[PDB]
Amino acid sequence: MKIIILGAGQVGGTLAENLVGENNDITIVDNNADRLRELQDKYDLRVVNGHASHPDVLHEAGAQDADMLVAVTNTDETNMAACQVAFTLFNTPNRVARIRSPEYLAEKEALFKSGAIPVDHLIAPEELVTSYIERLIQYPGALQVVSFAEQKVSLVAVKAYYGGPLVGNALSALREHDTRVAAIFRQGRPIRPQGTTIIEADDEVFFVAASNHIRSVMSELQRLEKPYRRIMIVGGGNIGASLAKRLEQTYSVKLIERDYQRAEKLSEQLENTIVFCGDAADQELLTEENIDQVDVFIALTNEDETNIMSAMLAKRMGAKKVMVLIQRGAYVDLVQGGVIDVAISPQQATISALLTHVRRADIVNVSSLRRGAAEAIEAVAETTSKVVGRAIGDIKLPPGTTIGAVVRGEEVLIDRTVIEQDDHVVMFLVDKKYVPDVEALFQP
Amino acid sequence: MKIIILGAGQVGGTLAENLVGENNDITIVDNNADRLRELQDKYDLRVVNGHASHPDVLHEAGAQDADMLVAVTNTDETNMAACQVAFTLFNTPNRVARIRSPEYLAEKEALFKSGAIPVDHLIAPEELVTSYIERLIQYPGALQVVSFAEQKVSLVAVKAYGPLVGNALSALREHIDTRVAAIFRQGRPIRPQGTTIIEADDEVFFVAASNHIRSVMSELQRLEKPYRRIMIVGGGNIGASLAKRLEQTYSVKLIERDYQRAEKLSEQLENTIVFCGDAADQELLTEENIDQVDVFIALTNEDETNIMSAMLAKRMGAKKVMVLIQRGAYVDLVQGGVIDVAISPQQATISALLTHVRRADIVNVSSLRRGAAEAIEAVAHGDETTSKVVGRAIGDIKLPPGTTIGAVVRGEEVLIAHDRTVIEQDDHVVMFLVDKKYVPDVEALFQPSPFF
Amino acid sequence: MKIIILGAGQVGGTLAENLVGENNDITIVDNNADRLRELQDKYDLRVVNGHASHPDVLHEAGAQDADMLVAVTNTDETNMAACQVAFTLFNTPNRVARIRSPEYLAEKEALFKSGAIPVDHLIAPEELVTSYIERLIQYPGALQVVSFAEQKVSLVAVKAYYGGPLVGNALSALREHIDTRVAAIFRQGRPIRPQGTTIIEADDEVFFVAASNHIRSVMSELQRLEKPYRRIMIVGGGNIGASLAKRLEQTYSVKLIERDYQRAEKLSEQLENTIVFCGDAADQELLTEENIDQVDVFIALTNEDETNIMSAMLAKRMGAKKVMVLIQRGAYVDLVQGGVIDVAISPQQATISALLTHVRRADIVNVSSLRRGAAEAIEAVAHGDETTSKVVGRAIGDIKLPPGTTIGAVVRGEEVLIAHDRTVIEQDDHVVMFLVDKKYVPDVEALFQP
Amino acid sequence: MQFRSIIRIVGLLLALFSVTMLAPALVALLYRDGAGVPFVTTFFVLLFCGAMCWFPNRRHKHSRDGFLIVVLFWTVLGSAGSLPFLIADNPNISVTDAFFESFSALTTTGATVIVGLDELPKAILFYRQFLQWFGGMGIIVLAVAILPVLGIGGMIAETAKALWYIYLSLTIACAVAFWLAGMTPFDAISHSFSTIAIGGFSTHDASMGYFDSYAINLITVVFLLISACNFTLHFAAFASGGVHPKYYWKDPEFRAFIFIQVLLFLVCFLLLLKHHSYTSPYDAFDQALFQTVSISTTAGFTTTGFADWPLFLPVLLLFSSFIGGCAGSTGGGMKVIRILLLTLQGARELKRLVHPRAVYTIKVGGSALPQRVVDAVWGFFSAYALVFVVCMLGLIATGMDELSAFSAVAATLNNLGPGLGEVALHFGDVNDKAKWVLIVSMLFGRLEIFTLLILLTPTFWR
Ligand SMILES: NC(=O)c1ccc[n+]([C@@H]2O[C@H](COP(=O)([O-])OP(=O)(O)OC[C@H]3O[C@@H](n4cnc5c(N)ncnc54)[C@H](O)[C@@H]3O)[C@@H](O)[C@H]2O)c1
Ligand SMILES: NC(=O)c1ccc[n+]([C@@H]2O[C@H](COP(=O)([O-])OP(=O)(O)OC[C@H]3O[C@@H](n4cnc5c(N)ncnc54)[C@H](O)[C@@H]3O)[C@@H](O)[C@H]2O)c1
Ligand SMILES: NC(=O)c1ccc[n+]([C@@H]2O[C@H](COP(=O)([O-])OP(=O)(O)OC[C@H]3O[C@@H](n4cnc5c(N)ncnc54)[C@H](O)[C@@H]3O)[C@@H](O)[C@H]2O)c1
């Protein structure tokens, strides 16, 4: 595959770095060449400096020979105009376009799913990060919560502690009885999840259940944490303010944002949350507003350092739990065994919702997971198929794969079950490098 | 007509201010409300605050009930996306859209007139300004040069400084197209007939063929010596474009104040010399032979520095100065003075916009002197029966008070107006209003009124 | 003379530009080298880039070998510290120092003339400008008002208009006669000979010299005292602006338009009794809304030169009675000659003058640069006795005054006696005279020494 | 620094070099003639030494190493490749002579010290050409392979095979053509080796003087011009079809190389005519066209001896030798783009004098050059001059006379390497120290001068 990525900025960067991971031909266009310097240096791909919405620039990038236009810039209007120009001048095949502005996708259908604005797929990255966080909150004790088939099946993840599990694997399963374990990570690489495995401490376990009986599973799993009441988020940016406006209903939320105008505007744009203008660092604001009575301290400013640091401080002044957003990987590794309870890298949301459009039609949802090295996909499917006649245990999945669930219209079915036509299959790759195989195994 | 103007600031301002003069319902949308306050105060129209490309905002402005969407902002991408959204979400009738970027209208046909980007008309305002200037240059001694029927007839303007002879007697000498459409003596013009005394210091409006115009200009007064060396201060859009154009037939020095802008300018044009520095400092000016330069064109955004720089440049002795003065009051302040020609970039865009607010029977319209007067190219798309004009002769038509036919265009022939010629089907008529307010009459007078 | 000028900025620029005109050795130090490039290119003087208050820099500049430290920078603290360091490290001779902050010269005596802060003379440049404007206001119809012997004799200047002058001088003078004599009259570029019988042409700039008491009366019965100013509007709320405001605000009603918000907001409390308007000096809106048609004088005092001139012309179109524009660029001042601007105030005519008083020796006590800066008007003492001096004792038409010079007045203690060709120069008396060309000033200086 | 992982690649290269000694040893048994005992001795000592390096290491600890490597690849290989020329007593020659021959061979310098090679083993001649071919690989895959270890863009092995194809399908495509204008197959392979790697080596002691057929002269011309031109630009060949046409006249480097070549030929020819230096106005054309292209594109092949040639011509040629080859080809002057840029930069410098307050920018294709590369170019030219005059002094000091040392440096710093000055060309019997000096001279000439100069700055370590 050869992709043109519009925008070497925030997202298009990581997007290039990842799509280069699988062997593809990547050309990346950008406004300013300094951001181009770095990925030119690093990832060995072709780079085009110039306005990413001009015909001559798209041409210079190879709009004619491309198979996919990943239009991800800061501006909505330029992304749209880009899809338009590429479509009516080069007939560029697959057109993904980042749209941030809410009052565009308000009439998403009337404005995109027509030949008016030729956008094939929209992809709003920040909304995904906020969704990720929101889920992490409404499911206490989770390290990651990804929902697949219209939020009906849910892959969930949880650390084994010195207290909670520590019993026979399929023997504890006898008690609960609608859920199977997709995978269990013990050190760096996982282990075979079957009926007779010993539960060690500090393991990362992956449930896959119905999205209804998941908070319930979380309950009789003996680790539903006490519901969060008081929430404080620092950074009033896109992700911050959006997570705010969402959480502001079910929860009480204090929001500390550093820019005055941004805060003042935040103050009217969202009723029912309290906007504090100031720094995420000063013990003053924190203690004066009871950083000790707060249930979760969520850091969401762009400076990675002040995020990690502010979080650590807030755990010292005694916040219950802290959620830090750390985009630089090296840092995420730096603060591993430490005080930070959960580190949220906002790549796990976008790499994931972009890969859904670089992988074929047989896969509708994909979701990058552990370190990004593993993958989890939702694949749709009597003569033409290798699947639709067999049972779950009867189809030959690639090495290190596990089917987890099946969605029949509105039903959710968690070793014996039978795959039917127009059914969704939620499965879990331990090594994403074996995804093209799964792809073939689900093709007519 | 009720128009929605997207974009207050630079263009939408004068556009609203002008369309409000004529009785229309104007709603104007803009990014920041500070730009909105001013025209809210002044011109009595409805104002919409918000991003001019959001469906809900277009709604708040009345995209459903409008007859015209003047999508003219700073950003191209938003103007286009605005027209797109307006068309597929409100089916807003008339969608003009300001496009700056040259590599868009490079495929003008392939990208807009294909219903892909639902833009009815493109309008590049700065291009109009540069073309205006360029014309003012390639016709030395002119104060204004507007060409109509595919650049075949041309209304021209010149201060009388050569003349001073019998009006209808100089017209005979010596083989001859042009007739005088109008002559401004003090504040209002006078009836130009066979018996007018030609006063000095008047502003005269010739109308001839676009071929025999440099020739008319020749047998006129003082055909001014062709310009060789040109210097422009301000390296902005209007400026850099005037540079990139003029740089072929002329030698051009371009002084721009911001370094980066100048530095990038330096590679964008391979035939001019880019100077980083201020339009003010006499040092750079004299150092680069501001005394040996033929025309000094000021094109920076600060109005004051434009006028001042021009006067300074005329003191150190540039032959001629062209100043761009957007605030009218100033244009009036610098009247009898040193400035040779003042270029208001409203007369360029108001004019090329009014061609799309008035009906099809007029194809070109052009605001002129103070903006109160107007000059239009009207087609006579009728029959001897259905139309009230065609078939008749020039002296026989009941023209609105203070109007005068000037020329007529039959295909590729250009026939200047004498009282005898006959108006035909599919003919163009270049005529001249002294007061724009009697334009609806001209519009009505050229429309196939139903005689049944 | 060799002077070191600390600060090549706003004032130090013109100061250098002028002291270089007369043949002197000028070394000029400045914060940033970009301002140094320009005068390095132009005026032939030595330039020193570096912090203008450091020992090594003073050294590099020649604090040791100089005769005068013109310490004129932006910061007060650095100017003071500079004179202190230069004195205790090089014993640098003549130390003038620009001080702006009012609560320093509040203790002018207690802090400087005590050898604590070794400043010989302080010189606050803006105060001269505000004073100048203020005078131009309290003398309607004046183009310039310079006072000499403790404000006792006054040189004044006024343009010829269609109403006041326009008649034969010695036939019309009888109608206003009388103590004042005309020192000079500019018709085109250079003046003509003023005696008992010279003929008056139109559109001339005339320079009177009378007692400072009997001048406002002289201004009246001369046929041109204009009706008293009531309402004043000033654009630009800077130092000159805000200070002129605080002074004028008592005797007059004042509207002040300043462009920066914070500046306006602070201005609003810094001066009680004036109305502060935040907005641009250009917009016709604010002007008409605030009766730019009922205003007696429109004084432009923003730093942008162009916008000052333009805004003034605009304010005269919407009908302000009079306009006072501040124009630091000379070329502009000549550009706007015969036009609508009633009076152009170059804020060099205020500081060059009060600085030249310290480069000319003791025999000249007050100096004042005037028309184009090429001309000068000085108060020279004939410090001597009947024997030792060549000036004292002779008569005016009899003393060999330098080419293009004119005695104007003589000051005896608290008495003021105007100069006729016969008068007697006495010991320790002051002589107010007028050069049309400054280059013959070293002559006048020698001419008054024992 | 970690030289420990560098030795891995070094030994691996000695072994990779050993397995190319079986190539002219396969001509020491094929062609009955001569002695190939050395080549099989060398294939052993090299494999042994190399593997004695690779094995006690095995560490892929993947700047300053990149440099040290790209000096090792020559300094080591060009030393090792002097081993056949030692043990072989068929052209029995001094050790210093052997080194001169090996380094000159591997560099694509093309300056021999063995006179009378016409009658030697078909193997030791093939080795001589094979060396040039092999080095002719290096000089163009180091216009790609350097990027990971070093920086061209610090001022992808997709194309490592893809270059070897454009190279192979050129040497083959030439060999055929040479043997179609009728050389013996041996002489037509071993001359395509030299003509594609722009090396200058021959089988005949008079190089391209065997058969004065304009066929071979005008073939060598046309294959030199192609080989002397930017393999990365050629890469518009395998990628897609034959859509070559526009790419060439697009790049202004090539566009300049063509003007240079043409002008040079024109003046040469026209002077060979005006001077009546040739009997028929055809041989004038022939000799001019072949000689300018050969000498200027750093080839070295000679078809004349400049007997009737006006002195102005071999001199102007020896100077044009300074600028030869589309950048990233097998040539090695101060490559064409350098001179193009240089002229641009100087033109600018000349412009600034007139209007000094003006902003002038250096324009090549579209985008301007940054003021970090103009600096680098100028510094390079200076350094170049420095090196030249230094080695000229080193030679005049060695014993050589003035003009000869001048021709020598001017021939080894560009890698020509005929004398070319005033008929004093022959290196065989030059001073012994001078030979070493000249070896240095051509190492500089290969490494573009900087990447060896920095090796002896203190700053390099550490
Ligand atoms: N989906 C995505 O948008 C996406 C994808 C990948 C990575 N990321 C990373 O996630 C980050 C968050 O995205 P966003 O668009 O919500 O951020 P943003 O650019 O909107 O900025 C976050 C806000 O927090 C403010 N802030 C408040 N207190 C602060 C303090 N003490 N120190 C520093 N800043 C403070 C900043 O001023 C800023 O207004 C981005 O910077 C981006 O690099 C985002
Ligand atoms: N066609 C139109 O877009 C249009 C229509 C109506 C009015 N106008 C007016 O015309 C103006 C010019 O348009 P533009 O896009 O070319 O302007 P612009 O915004 O590109 O700026 C003009 C340039 O002049 C430069 N400049 C050089 N010397 C200067 C000096 N001494 N002082 C101040 N500035 C200096 C500025 O740096 C700037 O780059 C607009 O600002 C607008 O007010 C334009
Ligand atoms: N004695 C002196 O200090 C002296 C001596 C010589 C020359 N000058 C000149 O006189 C000028 C005035 O001195 P100052 O200290 O009061 O100046 P300043 O630095 O305080 O600036 C003048 C003020 O006018 C304001 N302003 C208000 N409306 C404006 C508008 N519409 N356009 C532009 N500016 C506007 C500016 O924001 C600024 O605050 C100085 O800039 C200096 O060049 C002063």
Ligand SMILES: [K+]
């Ligand atoms: K060679």
